[PDB]
């Protein structure tokens, strides 16, 4: 009982009632979001996508958090050429919990 | 209010400091390049030097004279 859907350019396989982290979305932390772009739905019986994105499959998900990822330190260094550079990055992420998976 | 006065924008530049790190830009000789006479401490050529060629103020002939009546 799991489904495959495309959210932020990268596909996720999520089972019922589990939390999945995906790219930042323009949704407030206390609102449900829709994912009608369901790549595949799996159950005891198997249903595939003759046309991409099934026919009526949707996924109900609730936003939980809108935090930032772990800091990543970017170092660029040229050997013997008197060039050093430092940078930091924290990627924005959105935690969402899957509430319901349709057929 | 003595701790609220500020100068006009662009009045100060903070100057250039040489040889203080890589990220500061002009470090490691502070913008005077690699070896050479100009890179040395106190190096350089005097005014009018052309590297040995006859200077312009020597190739040309002196002309005229100064009139004392012009100053009065």
Curated annotation (Swiss-Prot), chain A:
Q: Which UniProt keywords apply?
A: Ribonucleoprotein, Ribosomal protein, RNA-binding, rRNA-binding
Question: Any idea what this protein is called?
Answer: Large ribosomal subunit protein bL21
Instruction: Give the UniProt record's GO annotations in the biological process aspect.
Output: cytoplasmic translation
The record's note on quaternary structure and interaction partners says:
Part of the 50S ribosomal subunit. Contacts protein L20.
| Cleavable signal peptide | none
Q: Which Pfam families match?
A: Ribosomal_L21p (PF00829)
This protein's record includes keyword DNA repair: no
**Keyword Ribosomal protein on entry:** yes
Family, per entry: Belongs to the bacterial ribosomal protein bL21 family.
From Swiss-Prot, chain B:
Record carries keyword Acetylation: no
User: Does the record's keyword annotation contain Transcription?
Assistant: no
Q: Where is the signal peptide?
A: none
Keywords tagged on the record: Ribonucleoprotein, Ribosomal protein, RNA-binding, rRNA-binding
BP GO terms, sorted: cytoplasmic translation
| Compositionally biased region (Gly residues) | 20-30
Which GO molecular function terms does the record list?
rRNA binding; structural constituent of ribosome
User: Would you tell me the Gene Ontology cellular component terms?
Assistant: cytoplasm; cytosolic large ribosomal subunit
Region Disordered: which residues?
Answer: 1-53
Subunit structure and binding partners: Part of the 50S ribosomal subunit. Contacts the 5S rRNA.
What role is this protein assigned? This protein binds the 5S rRNA. It is required for the late stages of subunit assembly, and is essential for 5S rRNA assembly onto the ribosome.
Q: Which family does it belong to?
A: Belongs to the universal ribosomal protein uL15 family.
UniProt protein name: Large ribosomal subunit protein uL15
What organism is listed for this UniProt entry? Escherichia coli (strain K12)
Organism taxonomic ancestry = Bacteria, Pseudomonadati, Pseudomonadota, Gammaproteobacteria, Enterobacterales
